[PDB]
Structure formats: structure tokens, C-alpha cells
Swiss-Prot record, chain B:
Disulfide cysteine pairs (residue numbers): none
Function comment: Involved in nucleolar processing of pre-18S ribosomal RNA. Required for the early cleavages at sites A0, A1 and A2 during 18S ribosomal pre-RNA processing.
Taxonomic placement: Eukaryota, Fungi, Dikarya, Ascomycota, Saccharomycotina
Family membership: Belongs to the MPP10 family.
Subunit structure: Component of a heterotrimeric complex containing IMP3, IMP4 and MPP10. Interacts with snoRNA U3. Component of the ribosomal small subunit (SSU) processome composed of at least 40 protein subunits and snoRNA U3. Interacts with the SSU processome subunits EMG1, IMP3, IMP4, KRR1, NOC4/UTP19, NOP1, RPS4A, RPS4B, RPS6A, RPS6B, RPS7A, RPS7B, RPS9A, RPS9B, RPS14A, RPS14B, UTP1-UTP18, UTP20-UTP22 and UTP25.
Gene name as annotated: MPP10
Subcellular location field: Nucleus, Nucleolus
UniProt name for this protein: U3 small nucleolar RNA-associated protein MPP10
Organism superkingdom: Eukaryota
Record's signal peptide: none
Swiss-Prot record, chain C:
Pfam families (alphabetical): Ribosomal_S9
Organism: Saccharomyces cerevisiae (strain ATCC 204508 / S288c)
Gene (name only): RPS16A
UniProt family annotation: Belongs to the universal ribosomal protein uS9 family.
Remaining remarks: Present with 33800 molecules/cell in log phase SD medium. There are 2 genes for uS9 in yeast.
One cellular-component annotation, GO: cytosol
Covalent link location (Glycyl lysine isopeptide (Lys-Gly) (interchain with G-Cter in ubiquitin)): 28, 45, 57
Function: Component of the ribosome, a large ribonucleoprotein complex responsible for the synthesis of proteins in the cell. The small ribosomal subunit (SSU) binds messenger RNAs (mRNAs) and translates the encoded message by selecting cognate aminoacyl-transfer RNA (tRNA) molecules. The large subunit (LSU) contains the ribosomal catalytic site termed the peptidyl transferase center (PTC), which catalyzes the formation of peptide bonds, thereby polymerizing the amino acids delivered by tRNAs into a polypeptide chain.
Name of protein: Small ribosomal subunit protein uS9A
UniProtKB/Swiss-Prot annotation, chain E:
Gene it is expressed from: UTP11
Organism annotation: Saccharomyces cerevisiae (strain ATCC 204508 / S288c) (Baker's yeast)
Coiled-coil region list: none
Compartments reported by the entry: Nucleus, Nucleolus
Function statement: Involved in nucleolar processing of pre-18S ribosomal RNA.
Protein name according to UniProt: U3 small nucleolar RNA-associated protein 11
Subunit structure: Component of the ribosomal small subunit (SSU) processome composed of at least 40 protein subunits and snoRNA U3. Interacts with snoRNA U3. Interacts with EBP2, FAF1, MPP10, RPS16A and RRP14.
UniProtKB/Swiss-Prot annotation, chain F:
Record text on subunit structure and interactions: Component of a heterotrimeric complex containing IMP3, IMP4 and MPP10. Interacts with MPP10. Component of the ribosomal small subunit (SSU) processome composed of at least 40 protein subunits and snoRNA U3.
Function: Required for the early cleavages at sites A0, A1 and A2 during 18S ribosomal pre-RNA processing.
Natural source organism: Saccharomyces cerevisiae (strain ATCC 204508 / S288c)
Name of the gene encoding the protein in the UniProt record: IMP3
Keywords: Nucleus, Ribonucleoprotein, Ribosome biogenesis, RNA-binding, rRNA processing, rRNA-binding
GO terms for cellular component: 90S preribosome; Mpp10 complex; nucleolus; nucleoplasm; small-subunit processome
Swiss-Prot/TrEMBL GO biological process terms: maturation of SSU-rRNA; ribosomal small subunit biogenesis; rRNA processing
Identification of the protein by name: U3 small nucleolar ribonucleoprotein protein IMP3
Start and end residues of each S4 RNA-binding domain: 48-114
Residues of the full protein shown: 62 to 183 of 183
Record GO terms (molecular function): RNA folding chaperone; rRNA binding; snoRNA binding
Subcellular localization, as worded in the UniProt entry: Nucleus, Nucleolus
Family: Belongs to the universal ribosomal protein uS4 family.
Length: 282, 94, 125, 410, 50, 122
RNA sequence: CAUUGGUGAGCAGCGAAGGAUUUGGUGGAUUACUAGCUAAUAGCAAUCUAUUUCAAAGAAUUCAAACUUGGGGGAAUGCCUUGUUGA
RNA sequence: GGAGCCAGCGAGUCUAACCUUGGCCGAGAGGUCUUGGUAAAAACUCCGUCGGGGAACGAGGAAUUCCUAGUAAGCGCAAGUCAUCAGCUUGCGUUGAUUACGUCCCUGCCCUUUGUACACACCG
RNA sequence: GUCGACGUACUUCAUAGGAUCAUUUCUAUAGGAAUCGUCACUCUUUGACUCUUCAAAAGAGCCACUGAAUCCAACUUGGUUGAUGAGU
């Protein structure tokens, strides 16, 4: 089993290497597509070539969800396990419970006397899609790690401006309807990665008249999450906020599972660079 | 075929498949094989298959699917209203 | 050759290596005889396999046990599992299969943790 | 696929979700839940029967899941997998929970008892273990390696004393009373066992056939010469025909297609076994078709509590002197089918209620067996009906207590 | 080195496993000598040297 | 190829064949249908064979020695062993090829690692 | 101190005109045992040849015949088919 | 108070305080000695001994929060990884429990009220 | 905010002459060297063969009869007036 996942990761890495060295080839085939589409001069290298002009029949016959999620995007509704750091604190326990309530298809795991590799392998043995692990400081929640399990990716965000729902008000209970999502101002390929990981973190295939909205807006590289219930009036549709609110911020992104600590870093927040204050998303 | 019997027929199979198959009534004795006995004796068709109650032919009468036929002449108007609402929810799904 | 056999025993995070070879009828655990294991209430739990089976079968052999890691109760369960599987292996290798089977039946009917350990992996729902 | 033996039609076809190939199948006693397991994705799929969707994907066996079955009398699922593991799933009762049990070697055969309380699992290391299922302890095991006769292939290079291609068990099944096990492997032999005394009854060699490979285990120094064992010499050229000359064999074809595609000899291996619910016969499906072995108490004589006086002569004498209970009890004690048939055909109806009521409990199974056989090949339908009516009305609740004791004759 | 340690592949057979031997700690022992013949002098050679 | 390009028959059939070959093991990269035409070699099939898989997984030492081992009967595919040396193996059984227990080979291996555990008589 | 490393000196015990190891050749086995040869209802078996020759029996696809070819391209001249020219 | 004995992550020519007392050396710069005061495996087992606090305080009400096995709790050792954390944060090992594993009756939540899916059965 | 016109910067291409080899003679040139019924020796390369190292794994298996080799014990013979060992 574990061997099967091992050689799986091997074959995925090899296909990535071939994809890199075939990007340029895809470009040359697209150019030849355009040339046959409209007769034009053909440029120097592809003009002089013999193998390309020979094998371009199958190639003409040739011809988007990210690859780590690709087979099971919208078929099997994902299952998530949310667990606490180590010898938990009580404020953190309440807030992790709130996160479990916030998502659907979620179950909670107290952690005392565990180790990271044993936990992650046990979760893979059980068969679980997605994992959330929480870290705090003095009651205040501050750090969150998301993983996708079949050697998928992990993201690590910090999270600051948290307020628990009960400490907003002693209100009542949520509805837990399969919610909705709005994604604002996302630009980069990194932005597409994070909207992809969060979309596959939610439930898949909601209704047409579901009455809970969950937002995601980029406000100066600080992903602000809110949650409101809405009921459609005739002229101004009223939104009642419920569920916790907190300011979330990316800082690192691994291409392995969270237990690895030495996978391929596909992004990492640069701090002490000359233009750190300058750029956005960098 | 030659590839699989080469390669020890363990493969990953054909993805998805649909095609309508007709069936005709000739009883199960002729359906089964050539041998001096028999095993099942009813028709190869079900009663629901050879006849379910069809939706009503003439226009002023209503056939439900459980065999209670009504007309628009022997109905009280409230039950007329109920029947219209039931057809409404049926055509609302369909 | 010297007719010999080797086995392992394992509680949660400890290791119990057991050599078993033909000899004069002794026990040795960490270079000290087995009247001197420490916890002194679980000494009987260490004694358990011998007192389950009998004593002559341990009168005609030689054990050498070395344990590392773990804590008290973990080491103790480790030693008892190691002695069990080692005795069964020696019987399987050099004397009759029927004796091996009656040994195995008496053990597993008593308590299966002697012959197979349970490394406790969790169940997530 | 479902199949209905009344209108001969696969009314429902259940599928996988990424289309993996299948190896084992198991069905709830109530025709409600059908579960299946593979060896390529090691997740037990399970469909509802009432609608052709797939209900759920049971998970938790690292590596392939080979055998499945059901405890019907409390309806639990048992899975047996190359994980070295046995899992027991409770899938109803709104808990849906697990219990695992480890076995020393990779298990590959599984069966349940009709009591639903004991599960017999068979390893690869030749052991056949038997568990209580309510608590997880190991009740009874039998080492079963040594009495398995493996052949030595002409294409081999070792001996049958060293080989390990067949020193295990493919398939297990329980007998319906709960006492005996049939076990069959890729060997040459079917073994038959008793569970409580944990000692086998017999070894059965399936086919003493030179043409198949794995029958003999000692080959002939006459045959093997200084170039090859003479049975790897292709004689396709010797044939006086083209259809016999050519082949189609592909290199290393195993488990596929016809036999012409194999430049090798067809191996012999008992593939599946089951007892009979309707008699003590048992059937073994092997590479040469189906074998069926039965019993004959007309040809044996295993009497029960004899004495110097009980005798065919005295039994016929008491029959003509009209003490029918004594005549019947004597003939049952002698257990000769012809005497039993004699007293059963000669006694009259106006003693049937009393006699049937005062037959005793130890002989009840024998008389039920005999009425079954005689009736299904006889001609006195009304007579045998009167007997079965009287016997059932006499000792109905007693059968209901010892249901498992008469579960093979009823 | 750590990634090799991940993909150990625990089934291999290198024939040096008949000649190498290993501590219980796991570490691979090696000789101060190097050769295959001077592991231990025998009694004839010790008679000569003495 | 001789079919016209934009037929869904053509597309779906070629893609299905590419699934079949990529699961079979002969061709490596699933995307270039040119490499369907041009990479398919008897060398590729014969390297999907059994003994090359041993030299792949570093079971045996070199390929001839692997052929000696499979002929001598020490190596099993899943639950049964193999004697026909010319076994083809796909990826999903490359996952399960291993040495047979209580072989002197596995004995030597775990002895060098000092981990023979003769309760299993490995 | 332990050595489950190497060698080598001696006992305790086992013990009938010796003991231990290795290796070649050969015989019988390794499927259920009706005798040898030939021109074969007989004869031979020390040999069939100076009876072993005659007669009878018997000639369709008017010559049907690569079921067998590694894959894409074509083949001057050969080869096969198709028509045609002249005897 | 003795005495017995048990773990696991970790290794960048890299890992670390303060002021004070004076002698001597030198043009110094400062150097060296001298001197006083302040910040920084354990539980386990066994044996031997003993039997209110320097004015608040003797296990912490009303309410309220969480949790169903390597979990609650207890005990320590290590690090300090481009965001957070030194008033701490995160790793690892040790020891390892009581009580539920059923239920929709209350509290809330959802889904379905059209057999639609192909036998037999069930309802209609 | 995209695109047209300009302006401007950048990337990109020719090759010629002479020789030789290629048609089972002959690449087109007469400027160029090659025809034979073998007798012996040395050297060198390449392998078959028997053994074998690095370093194994497995045995067409049983029994009997007749041979051999090795090592012990036992015996004989030589030996402190010197056997074994050891680079003028």
C-alpha cells in the first residue's frame, strides 16, 4: 500500500518533468496549427525540421482543475478532519469546534499523545480527503495548516482578527446548509491555487436556493473571511452575519504532505527582501 | 483481446456504457437451453411490462396509475381543484 | 553449527531481543538473572509464560534477553512477548511440530498478546 | 449483476465509480445489500439492491481485500485482506463501526458459521484459524501444512519437498451443522476436517492424471535426459495437419483466454468448494469440471449402541409380533437401510400418531434424513406426507430449539 | 540522504550481505585491516611469529 | 491518423487506447500520441518483463541473476509464485512483486540487517 | 566482562575383531508385468534364395490448393492478374 | 533522607550576562592579574524517619464551556526553522483511566413527500 | 481599457573550391598501387573447452553393489649421535 503511494509520487514527479520539457513543444504545435489554419511563412527551426512535419497527424488530432484534485473534483464530496495542536487550550478548543461547525462533512480530533507521521498515515489508511490542524497563542488563534491527503499540497496561513461566535453573542444555532462562495479580486496563478484548494475544501454541488453565504475577498493580501445568512427581500436583501470572523494571511505552501518538512516548495513568503513592502503577492 | 490474453487480463476496464436492449415474449422454456428438462415456466415478460395502465385516452376523463378512473363529470369541484394541484406538483417536478 | 534461534518482542516504544539456544537450563536478562527484574509487582507478569507452560521445557534451553527503550510496563510486556515467541520458535525449529502446536494452543487460549502484539494505530471516523 | 432465475434477466447492473475490476462478492441474507471487493483499489464498494446506485465505499484495508462474507443471524460484514488483517464492520444500527483483528500471515480465505458467531479464516502460512467473533480471542486453530500434496512441474527446477506454490489454502467452507471444514488449495488435494477435535478426517487426491502437471511429485530419471526433460520438446511438427502445427501462444500468458495460447500444460488446482445443504455431499470445482462426493450408509455400517440381542432376525420377529416402536428402534440401532425401509414400509397408519410421538430425540435426525431420501425417490407421496405431518406435529418446538442440529435435513 | 532514507525499498539482495556484518545498533562495522584473509592469525603462523 | 481529425470517435478511441497502454506499461508518457506511433518498442515491452522489473526494484543484482532466481523459484507475484520466466507485469502488480517467505534469500537479507524473526520462520 | 568470531591443545560421557567426511562407475526402481524378427491367419529363429515370377485391384476437382506475410511507403526489372498483337 | 532502574526527537570553526574592589605594565590605546555582590529525566519502586499560615487564605457558588481510547488527566526532556510565539510557542516520550457506543421523547438542524429504477416482494 | 498609424529598438538568411567513398567493372577521371592452385616458423587477437574468484541460490532426489581420495585412531619404520620448520 505505502509502496503504492510511493511509486505514485514517483510517477507524478516524472510526469511533471515531461510536462516541463514539452511546454515548448506544445507551443510549436500551436504555431503549426495557426499556420495550417492560415497559410503563412513558416519560421526557421520548425520549418527546417523533419520529425515535426512528419509526426503532425496524431499531433493535430491532439488538443481547468489542478492536477492534485483532478479525478475527484465534483464527484465524491470531500471529508475533512480538523485537529488541535498539542495539549490543547480551552479557547482553542471552542474555536476549532466552530471551524468544524463552519464547514460541512467535518469531524473533530483532540490530540494528546500523537505524533505527526503516525497521525497522517493513520488518516491515509482510514481514507480521508482533507485535513486542518490548528495552532494558537495564549487563547488567540493564529496559525492554520491545510493538507490534501493523497500526497497533495499543504498551505500554511496565519490568522489574527478572530472573534468566537458565542463571544459575539449568545445567539443560537446555525443552519449548516451547504453554503455558497464568493471570490473577489483574485489575480495570480497562486490566487487560482488558493481558490482551488478552498473550493475543494468546501462541499461540492450546492443547491439553487441555499441560504448561507461565505465570502472570500482579497483586501491587500489579507484574505478576509466572513459569513452571513441572507433572506431575499423585495428591494434590499438583508444579510445577517453569523459565524466567526478572522483575518487570514498566507505565508507558505508545500507540494507534499505536512509531515514532510522537505518537499518541493512551490511558494514561500519572502520577508527580508528589498521590495517586500513594495509588491503585492510578493 | 490479444493484448489482455498477453498481459494477464488484469486491466482497468472500459469507462461507461449505455444501450437500449429490446425484449420479446417467448416463454422461459424456450429461453433456456437444449436438455430434456425445464426449470422456469412463466413468460419472459412481466405483467407491468406487457401492460401498465396508460394515461387516459379520451379527454374528459382522468386515469391515475393505480387503476381508479375518474371523469370531469362525476367530480365535485373541490376534488377537481385537488386533482389539478396534484397534476401541478407532478408537472412541477417533470 | 549451534542450533539457535532469534526473535523480537515489542510494546509501544520498546524492544526486547531474545536469543534462544540449547544449553544448561538458565535464564539471563540484561546480564542479570531473572529473579531481579525491577518493578517487583510485574515480576510475576514476566514470569507468566513459564508458569503457564511448565518448567522442564525451560530446564533444557538457554535464553538471553536484552531490552532497550520504553518505560517500565512497556519493557515488561516486551520481555514476556519475546520469551513466548522465542520458545515457540525454538520448538518449531529443533523439536516436534506437535509440541509446537500444543504450546501455541495453550498460549493463545490464555492471552493473545503473547504471540501477536498490538501497535495501537488510531481509528479516525 | 443481479440475475433472476424466473425470467432470466439481469434486472440490475451495479457498477464502480472509477471502474475497477472485481474479485469477491457477498450478499445480505435479505436481498437488500450487495457488497463487493477488489484487488486493485482495496476499498469495499457496497450497493443497495432496491436502487442501482452505489451506497458507500467502506475503507480501511491497506492493500487488497480478498474475501468477504456475512454473519446473517446478527448481520455483520467480515472482510479478510492481505493487510494481515480481518476487519468486522457493523454497517447498520446507526453506528457504522469497526473492529480489527490481526493474523500472523496474510489471510486469503474466509467463512462464517451458521450460528454467525465463529469465523474460520485461512492464512498463507498453512494455518487455518477459527475465531469467536463477539469477543476477539482466537478459539481454535489447526496447522494444516504437512498433509498437502503438491506436484513438481516438469518446467520446474526444485522439488515438491521444497516448493511453496501450493502449501496453503485457496478456499474454505463450513458444513452446515458446524463441525466439519472442507478446505481446498492450489494443491492436488482436498482436505476434510473436524473443528472441535481439531484433527483432520481425510485427504482426497483430486486427479491422478499424468497429462496435467501438478499430479505427480516424483518424476522419472528415465525421462529427463541431458538436454531437457523430454516434455518440453514441441511436437507441433510431428502433427500431420496445419491446424495442429501452428499455435498462437504469447510469452508468459497466465490467466487468459483459451489453452491453445499456452505452450505449457494446464495446471490442476481445486478452485472452489461447498457442502450440500440437502445431504452430506460436498462438491469441489476444479480444473477438470465438478466433482461431487456423497455418503452411503447402505455400504457402510456404523451402528449405535448394539447388544447381543438386537439383530435383523429379532427385529423382523418383533415386527411380525407387532410392537412397532420396538421394531423401529431396533432397526435404527442397527442402521441398515434395508431393514429401516422394511419397517417403514410395513407399519400401518393407525399406529402412526402414537409411534411418531414416542420416537426419541437421539434418533430424530436419522428418521428425518431417511424420510427425505425415500420420499424424493419413492412413490408413496401420501404416506410420506403423513409421516412428516405426524413427526412435525409431534416434535416441532424441539426442532426449533436444535434448529442448527436439523438445519441440514429439513 | 533523507530522501534515500524515505525510499529504502526493504527487499533488496546484494551479495555483499554474505560478507558484511552489522552491529545491533544498525551501524555498519568495518575493519581496521581491510583484507579478507588477515582477520585472525592461526596457530601455525603464531608459532612462527613468536 | 487517416481518419479526419475532429471526430469524437477518433478522439475518444485514441484516448482510450492511451489509457490501455499507459496502464499496460509499454509507453511512458500518456500525452504524445506521436509517442504512441513512435515510442512503442519491443524493447519497451521486454523491459516491462519480469526480470527487468527485478533489476528495476533492485531486488536481484543483475538481470541474468534475476533470471536464475526466478527459474529457481524464490520470487512470488502476490499470493502465488512464478516459474515461467517471461512474465509480463503491469504497474498494479509491480506494486506486489516480492520475495517468498522462508526463503534463504529473505533469511540472508534480514540476517544482515540482524532482524530475522523466526517466529514467522522468515 | 560478554563474544551467536577465528583457530588449537585436553578431558567427562558414548563405544563387539575401527571410526568420520567426500567422490566415480554400474544395477534395480521411479505409470499396471502378455515373450524376438519378417514380406505376419504362417515361416524363421544355422538363411531365405535357383518358385518370388504371373494374373487380378487401382489414374475426377480435365493442374482446386501459402488459411502460415513485423509496420507504415512505393516496386525499374522480375512475379501475379487483366485485356491486346502475330503465328 | 537513601538506594534501585527506564525514553525520544536534536549537532552551521557553532551556544552566549552585569556592574564592583584594587596591584602592576605601558606615552597612550589599553593590557594583565586581583576582588565583592546580583539574572539564569521526572513521576515509578523499595527501605529508614516524622506526624493552620508571615492580613489574606482549608479544593473555589450562581451561571457557563468542552469530551467517548492510546482520548480526559498527570509527569517531565528537546528545540525556537523567511508568518505568529519568549509573560511564551512547538515538538517527543513516559503513565494511562470512569462512563456512554442507543435514542429521536425534549432541543434544534436537514431531507423527502412524484415508486420511475428493469425482476420477486411491498404498498398504492 | 484594448486596438489601429507612426517612430524606435531587437532576432533571422547567403555561400565557394578541391579531394575521396559509394553501380558485384565503370560516380565520368586516363597524372593512378595492386591478377599466381602454400611449403615451414614466430608473434598477436578472438573465442570453445575443465576448474575457479568477487558471492551466491538450487539440486531427477531412493536403495544396492563395486572402486578411489582425504582425516582420525591403531601399527611399522626413521629420529636428541637431531624429526618438523626457516632468504647463502
Amino acid at each position: 500500500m505505502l509502496r503504492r503511494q510511493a511509486r505514485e509520487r514517483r510517477e507524478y514527479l516524472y510526469r511533471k518533468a515531461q510536462e516541463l520539457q514539452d511546454s515548448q513543444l506544445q507551443q510549436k504545435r500551436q504555431i503549426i496549427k495557426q499556420a495550417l489554419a492560415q497559410g503563412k511563412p513558416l519560421p526557421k527551426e520548425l520549418a527546417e525540421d523533419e520529425s515535426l512535419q512528419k509526426d503532425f497527424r496524431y499531433d493535430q488530432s491532439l488538443k481547468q482543475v489542478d492536477d492534485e484534485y483532478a479525478a475527484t473534483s465534483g464527484i465524491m464530496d470531500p471529508r475533512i478532519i480538523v485537529t488541535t495542536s498539542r495539549d490543547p487550550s480551552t479557547r482553542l478548543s471552542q474555536f476549532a469546534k466552530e471551524i468544524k461547525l463552519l464547514f460541512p462533512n467535518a469531524v473533530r480530533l483532540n490530540r494528546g499523545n500523537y505524533v505527526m507521521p503516525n497521525l497522517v498515515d493513520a488518516c491515509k489508511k482510514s481514507g480521508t480527503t482533507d485535513l486542518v490542524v490548528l495552532h494558537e497563542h495564549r487563547g488567540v488563534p493564529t496559525s492554520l495548516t491545510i493538507s490534501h491527503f493523497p500526497h497533495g499540497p499543504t498551505a500554511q496561513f496565519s490568522l489574527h482578527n478572530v472573534v468566537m461566535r458565542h463571544d459575539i453573542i449568545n445567539a443560537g444555532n446555525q443552519s449548516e446548509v451547504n453554503p455558497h462562495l464568493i471570490f473577489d479580486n483574485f489575480t495570480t496563478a497562486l490566487g487560482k491555487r488558493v481558490v482551488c484548494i478552498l473550493k475543494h475544501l468546501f462541499n461540492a454541488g450546492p443547491k439553487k436556493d441555499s441560504e448561507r453565504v461565505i465570502t472570500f475577498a482579497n483586501r491587500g493580501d489579507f484574505i478576509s473571511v466572513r459569513q452571513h445568512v441572507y433572506v431575499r427581500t423585495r428591494e434590499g436583501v438583508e444579510i445577517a452575519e453569523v459565524g466567526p470572523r478572522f483575518e487570514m494571511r498566507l505565508f507558505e505552501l508545500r507540494l507534499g504532505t505536512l509531515e514532510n518538512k522537505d518537499a518541493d516548495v512551490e511558494w514561500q513568503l519572502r520577508r527580508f527582501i528589498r521590495t517586500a513592502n513594495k509588491k503585492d503577492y510578493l | 483481446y490479444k493484448l489482455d490474453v498477453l498481459s494477464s487480463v488484469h486491466f482497468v476496464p472500459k469507462p461507461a456504457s449505455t444501450s437500449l436492449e429490446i425484449r420479446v415474449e417467448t416463454p422461459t422454456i424456450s429461453m433456456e437451453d437444449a436438455q430434456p428438462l425445464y426449470m422456469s415456466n412463466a413468460s419472459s415478460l412481466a405483467p407491468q411490462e406487457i401492460y401498465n395502465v396508460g394515461k387516459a385516452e379520451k379527454d374528459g376523463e382522468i386515469r391515475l396509475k393505480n387503476g381508479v378512473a375518474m371523469s370531469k363529470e362525476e367530480l365535485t369541484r373541490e376534488d377537481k381543484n385537488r386533482l389539478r394541484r396534484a397534476l401541478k406538483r407532478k408537472r412541477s417536478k417533470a | 553449527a549451534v542450533p539457535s534461534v532469534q526473535t523480537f518482542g515489542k510494546k509501544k516504544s520498546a524492544t526486547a531481543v531474545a536469543h534462544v539456544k540449547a544449553g544448561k537450563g538458565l535464564i539471563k536478562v540484561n546480564g542479570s538473572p531473572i529473579t531481579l527484574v525491577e518493578p517487583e509487582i510485574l515480576r510475576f507478569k514476566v514470569y507468566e509464560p513459564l508458569l503457564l507452560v511448565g518448567l522442564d521445557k525451560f530446564s533444557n534451553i538457554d535464553i538471553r534477553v536484552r531490552v532497550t527503550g520504553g518505560g517500565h510496563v512497556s519493557q515488561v510486556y516486551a520481555i514476556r512477548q519475546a520469551i513466548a515467541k522465542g520458545l515457540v520458535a525454538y520448538h518449531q525449529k529443533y523439536v516436534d511440530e506437535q509440541s509446537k502446536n500444543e504450546l501455541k494452543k495453550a498460549f493463545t487460549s490464555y492471552d493473545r498478546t503473547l504471540l501477536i502484539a498490538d501497535s495501537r494505530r488510531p481509528e479516525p471516523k | 449483476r443481479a440475475w433472476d432465475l424466473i425470467r432470466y434477466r439481469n434486472f440490475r447492473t451495479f457498477t464502480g465509480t472509477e471502474r475497477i475490476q472485481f474479485n469477491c462478492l457477498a450478499v445480505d441474507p435479505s436481498g437488500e445489500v450487495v457488497c463487493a471487493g477488489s484487488l486493485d483499489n482495496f476499498d469495499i464498494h457496497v450497493w443497495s439492491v432496491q436502487t442501482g446506485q452505489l451506497l458507500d465505499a467502506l475503507s480501511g484495508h491497506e492493500g487488497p481485500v480478498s474475501c468477504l462474507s456475512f454473519s446473517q443471524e446478527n448481520s455483520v460484514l467480515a472482510s479478510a485482506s492481505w493487510d494481515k488483517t480481518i476487519r468486522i464492520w457493523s454497517i447498520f444500527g446507526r453506528s457504522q463501526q469497526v473492529e480489527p483483528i490481526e493474523v500472523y500471515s496474510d489471510v486469503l480465505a474466509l467463512s462464517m458459521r451458521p450460528d454467525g458467531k465463529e469465523v474460520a479464516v485461512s492464512t498463507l502460512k498453512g494455518q487455518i484459524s477459527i475465531f469467536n467473533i463477539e469477543d476477539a480471542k482466537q478459539v481454535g486453530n489447526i496447522d494444516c501444512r504437512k498433509d498437502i500434496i503438491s506436484g513438481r512441474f516438469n518446467q520446474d527446477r526444485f522439488t515438491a519437498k521444497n516448493s511453496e506454490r501450493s502449501k496453503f489454502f485457496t478456499t474454505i467452507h463450513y458444513s452446515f451443522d458446524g463441525m466439519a471444514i472442507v478446505a481446498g488449495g492450489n494443491n492436488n488435494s482436498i482436505c476434510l476436517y473436524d473443528v472441535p477435535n481439531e484433527v483432520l478426517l481425510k485427504r482426497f487426491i483430486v486427479s491422478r492424471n499424468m497429462a496435467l502437471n501438478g499430479t505427480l511429485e516424483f518424476l522419472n530419471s528415465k525421462k529427463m535426459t541431458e538436454a531437457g526433460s523430454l516434455d518440453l520438446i514441441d511436437d507441433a511438427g510431428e502433427n500431420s495437419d496445419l491446424e495442429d502445427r501452428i499455435d498462437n501462444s504469447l510469452p508468459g500468458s497466465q490467466r487468459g483466454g483459451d489453452l491453445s495460447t499456452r505452450k505449457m500444460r494446464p495446471e490442476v488446482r481445486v478452485t472452489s468448494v461447498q457442502f450440500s445443504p440437502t445431504a452430506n455431499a460436498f462438491a469441489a470445482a476444479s480444473t477438470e469440471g465438478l466433482l461431487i462426493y456423497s455418503t452411503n450408509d447402505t455400504i457402510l455400517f456404523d451402528p449405535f449402541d448394539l447388544d447381543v440381542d438386537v439383530t435383523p432376525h429379532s427385529t423382523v420377529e418383533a415386527l411380525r409380533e407387532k410392537q412397532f416402536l420396538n421394531a423401529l428402534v431396533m432397526a435404527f440401532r442397527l442402521n441398515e437401510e434395508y431393514l429401516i425401509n422394511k419397517v417403514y414400509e410395513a407399519i400401518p397408519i393407525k399406529e402412526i400418531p402414537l409411534v411418531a410421538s414416542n420416537i426419541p430425540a437421539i434418533y430424530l435426525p436419522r428418521i428425518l434424513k431417511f424420510i427425505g431420501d425415500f420420499a424424493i425417490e419413492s412413490q408413496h407421496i401420501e404416506f410420506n406426507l403423513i409421516w412428516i405431518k405426524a413427526l412435525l406435529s409431534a416434535s416441532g418446538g424441539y426442532i426449533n430449539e436444535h434448529k442448527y442440529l436439523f438445519s441440514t435435513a429439513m | 540522504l533523507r530522501e534515500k532514507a524515505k525510499e529504502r525499498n526493504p527487499d533488496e539482495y546484494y551479495h555483499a550481505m554474505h560478507s558484511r556484518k552489522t552491529d545491533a545498533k544498525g551501524l555498519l562495522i568495518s575493519s581496521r585491516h581491510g583484507d579478507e584473509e588477515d582477520e585472525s592469525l592461526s596457530m601455525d603462523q603464531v608459532k612462527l611469529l613468536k | 491518423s487517416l481518419l479526419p481529425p475532429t471526430d469524437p470517435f477518433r478522439r475518444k478511441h485514441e484516448q482510450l487506447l492511451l489509457d490501455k497502454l499507459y496502464a499496460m506499461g509499454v509507453l511512458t508518457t500518456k500525452s504524445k500520441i506521436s509517442d504512441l506511433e513512435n515510442k512503442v518498442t519491443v524493447s519497451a515491452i521486454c523491459r516491462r518483463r519480469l526480470p527487468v522489473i527485478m533489476h528495476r526494484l533492485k531486488m536481484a543484482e543483475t538481470i541474468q541473476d534475476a533470471v536464475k532466481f526466478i527459474e529457481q523459484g524464490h520470487v512470488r507475484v502476490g499470493p502465488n509464485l512464478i516459474n515461467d520466466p517471461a512474465y509480463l507485469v503491469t504497474r498494479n502488480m509491480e506494486d506486489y512483486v516480492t520475495w517468498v517467505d522462508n526463503s534463504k534469500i529473505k533469511k540472508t537479507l534480514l540476517r544482515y540487517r540482524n532482524q530475522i524473526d523466526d517466529f514467522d520462520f522468515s
